[PDB]
Amino acid sequence: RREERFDAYSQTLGGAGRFDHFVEWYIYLHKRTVSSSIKELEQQVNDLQRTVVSVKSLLEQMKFKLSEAIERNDAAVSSRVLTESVQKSIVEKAICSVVPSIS
Amino acid sequence: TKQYERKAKGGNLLSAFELYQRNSGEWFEMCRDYIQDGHVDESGIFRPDNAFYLRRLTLKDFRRFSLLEIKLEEDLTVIIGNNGKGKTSILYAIAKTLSWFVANILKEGGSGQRLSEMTDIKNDAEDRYSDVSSTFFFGKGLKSVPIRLSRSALGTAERRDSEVKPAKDLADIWRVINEVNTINLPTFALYNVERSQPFNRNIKDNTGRREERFDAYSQTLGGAGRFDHFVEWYIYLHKRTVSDISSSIKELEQQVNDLQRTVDGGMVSVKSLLEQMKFKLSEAIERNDAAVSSRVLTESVQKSIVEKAICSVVPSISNIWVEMITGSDLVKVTNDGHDVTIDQLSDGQRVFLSLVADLARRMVMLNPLLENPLEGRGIVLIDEIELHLHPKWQQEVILNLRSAFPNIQFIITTHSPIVLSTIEKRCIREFEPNDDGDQSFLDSPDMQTKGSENAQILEQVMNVHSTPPGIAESHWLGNFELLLLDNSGELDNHSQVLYDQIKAHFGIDSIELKKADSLIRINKMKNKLNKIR
Numbered sequence: 027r028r029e030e031r032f033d034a035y036s037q038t039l040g041g042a043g044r045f046d047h048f049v050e051w052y053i054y055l056h057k058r059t060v061s062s063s064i065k066e067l068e069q070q071v072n073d074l075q076r077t078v079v080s081v082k083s084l085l086e087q088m089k090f091k092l093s094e095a096i097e098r099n100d101a102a103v104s105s106r107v108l109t110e111s112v113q114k115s116i117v118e119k120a121i122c123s124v125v126p127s128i129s
Numbered sequence: 130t131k132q133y134e135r136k137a138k139g140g141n142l143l144s145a146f147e148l149y150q151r152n153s154g155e156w157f158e159m160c161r162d163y164i165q166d167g168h169v170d171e172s173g174i175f176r177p178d179n180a181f182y183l184r185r186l187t188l189k190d191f192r193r194f195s196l197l198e199i200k201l202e203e204d205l206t207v208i209i210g211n212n213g214k215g216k217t218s219i220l221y222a223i224a225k226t227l228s229w230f231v232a233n234i235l236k237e238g239g240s241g242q243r244l245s246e247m248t249d250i251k252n253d254a255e256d257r258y259s260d261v262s263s264t265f266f267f268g269k270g271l272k273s274v275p276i277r278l279s280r281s282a283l284g285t286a287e288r289r290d291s292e293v294k295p296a297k298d299l300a301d302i303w304r305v306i307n308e309v310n311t312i313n314l315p316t317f318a319l320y321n322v323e324r325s326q327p328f329n330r331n332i333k334d335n336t337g338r339r340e341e342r343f344d345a346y347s348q349t350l351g352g353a354g355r356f357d358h359f360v361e362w363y364i365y366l367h368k369r370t371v372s373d374i375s376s377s378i379k380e381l382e383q384q385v386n387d388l389q390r391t392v393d394g395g396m397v398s399v400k401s402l403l404e405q406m407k408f409k410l411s412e413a414i415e416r417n418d419a420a421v422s423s424r425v426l427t428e429s430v431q432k433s434i435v436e437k438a439i440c441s442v443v444p445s446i447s448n449i450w451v452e453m454i455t456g457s458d459l460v461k462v463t464n465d466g467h468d469v470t471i472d473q474l475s476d477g478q479r480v481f482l483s484l485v486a487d488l489a490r491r492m493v494m495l496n497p498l499l500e501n502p503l504e505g506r507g508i509v510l511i512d513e514i515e516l517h518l519h520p521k522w523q524q525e526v527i528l529n530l531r532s533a534f535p536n537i538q539f540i541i542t543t544h545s546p547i548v549l550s551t552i553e554k555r556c557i558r559e560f561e562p563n564d565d566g567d568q569s570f571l572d573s574p575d576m577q578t579k580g581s582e583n584a585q586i587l588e589q590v591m592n593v594h595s596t597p598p599g600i601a602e603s604h605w606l607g608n609f610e611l612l613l614l615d616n617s618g619e620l621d622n623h624s625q626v627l628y629d630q631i632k633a634h635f636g637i638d639s640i641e642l643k644k645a646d647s648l649i650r651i652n653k654m655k656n657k658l659n660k661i662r
């Protein structure tokens with residue numbers, strides 16, 4: 027399942043703050059944020075599909091981006107959320123600001 | 130109401146049951162008779178008047194299938210096709226549907242199994258949901274029992290809900306009537322490729338769960354059976370046959386009477402022991418009464434039925450029995466004329482033994498009122514029936530199963546032309562070899578398979594050359610013939626060399642050499658005629 031806004035309330039009042047959960051989450055966010063209109067993206071995906079061997083990796087990345095964009099578009103106001111890249115950056119800054127001797 | 134009364138008197142089972150539920154004798158008896166009535170055929174086989182089987186299956190956006198519709202036979206349906214055609218997917222779909230009957234026979238409002246969001250939805254489904262629609266038949270009173278399992282993909286535009294109420298309603302009839310008076314129940318089982326698994330020697334002792342009737346529904350649709358449960362149950366049966374329960378009751382009754390006399394004689398110290406023994410006696414009587422109340426086959430008879438079934442269906446096994454060796458009970462078998470333990474059996478023998486033993490156990494438990502419990506109703510799914518079997522066994526396996534379990538609907542998958550040679554073409558449903566997932570109908574082959582040569586079935590049904598095309602020697606006879614025809618039928622240097630190669634490779638007595646010889650003879654004679662002309 028994808029992450030959803032009200033997961034923030036899951037186990038908030040017991041079970042929170044476990045190191046393994048962080049590491050797993052952080053690596054996940056990194057992999058997703060390693061490498062923007064839907065119609066434009068749809069057009070780019072279509073153009074890349076027509077070209078498709080060396081561009082196959084790029085096509086798969088763009089298809090993922092398109093699916094995500096559609097999902098965000100389809101997703102409700104009540105679940106509306108910041109990009110994974112932004113989320114990652116905020117958490118990184120929080121850690122470095124707060125934790126003694128981690129820069 | 131008057132309408133329900135009319136329909137019920139017309140033989141509608143649901144209407145009769147509804148009238149029974151609202152008034153809660155005549156309606157009960159009608160429902161019970163609908164389930165229990167049957168007749169013995171000319172071959173001495175009991176046949177229910179109202180048969181239960183899966184009639185039709187439809188798959189929409191399920192795994193590889195955009196849309197698929199299948200009509201099934203009452204007795205035997207065999208699905209064939211290349212690897213990755215979805216044969217297993219079909220069986221899984223049926224199994225999930227059957228899970229809803231099982232759950233509701235066991236418990237009111239029990240839930241069966243759902244379709245997976247991750248694996249069961251076709252990858253490029255536009256509507257992003259999957260449907261498994263099944264229609265069951267239960268006699269003329271209930272000609273159509275439609276069930277639909279549905280699942281929407283993870284992104285979720287809208288919920289698509291499953292429609293399972295008819296399964297629940299029918300299962301409720303079986304459950305409620307059984308509660309009042311014991312009836313025979315349908316067997317549902319899936320045997321997938323997971324049945325091939327190593328045997329654990331360590332038999333857990335009878336905690337008590339394996340003797341309960343509805344243990345027959347335990348993990349029936351999990352794919353492997355429970356051969357461990359069979360062994361436990363069979364040893365249990367053996368121990369009970371060596372020791373009668375009523376003699377224990379009579380002995381316990383005598384002990385209670387002796388202890389009561391001692392307490393009456395002034396020995397108050399043994400009162401605690403008397404109370405314990407009275408409890409034990411009451412429990413023994415209750416078990417006896419429950420056994421009596423269940424109207425069940427005797428443990429000796431149950432044992433015999435299962436043993437006969439195993440020995441009849443499994444060719445290498447002539448006898449099976451329980452030995453007390455050292456201080457632990459061991460099941461032994463006469464396999465290929467030698468006495469061995471189960472752990473000594475070959476994988477092919479063990480896997481097949483496991484299937485039959487498990488099925489027989491469940492049938493005995495679910496059909497206590499039948500003279501032959503193996504003549505009960507049910508639906509059994511078997512994936513890759515030929516698994517681990519030599520060709521000689523493949524020629525017997527379907528015949529043996531159908532003989533032992535005459536009223537079960539078998540839905541099976543196979544890759545074996547030898548198996549297909551024993552089956553009528555009407556029972557066969559074949560995928561087109563070039564199927565890219567957009568095939569509405571599975572169809573019967575054009576050739577009659579039953580009694581046909583295996584080589585023909587390979588070529589005409591399985592689409593495989595009888596001779597391996599990627600071996601050069603497979604083409605030598607063809608090449609030889611061409612050379613003979615190029616040189617006006619006379620053996621030239623080139624044709625002689627190839628002839629010698631054929632002789633050297635296949636041998637002097639080979640069919641191939643005889644064909645070559647035949648070609649020489651015919652062509653020489655044809656040429657002589659041509660010269661005369």
Ligand SMILES: Nc1ncnc2c1ncn2[C@@H]1O[C@H](COP(=O)(O)OP(=O)(O)O)[C@@H](O)[C@H]1O
Nearest residue numbers: 192193212213214215216217218248250251252
């Ligand atoms: N969700 C799916 N979407 C598309 N194709 C799928 C999906 N799941 C399985 N497949 C394809 O279906 C086949 C697996 O079907 P299976 O029932 O195991 O075949 P068989 O029993 O004939 O060997 C493979 O070709 C696989 O690529």
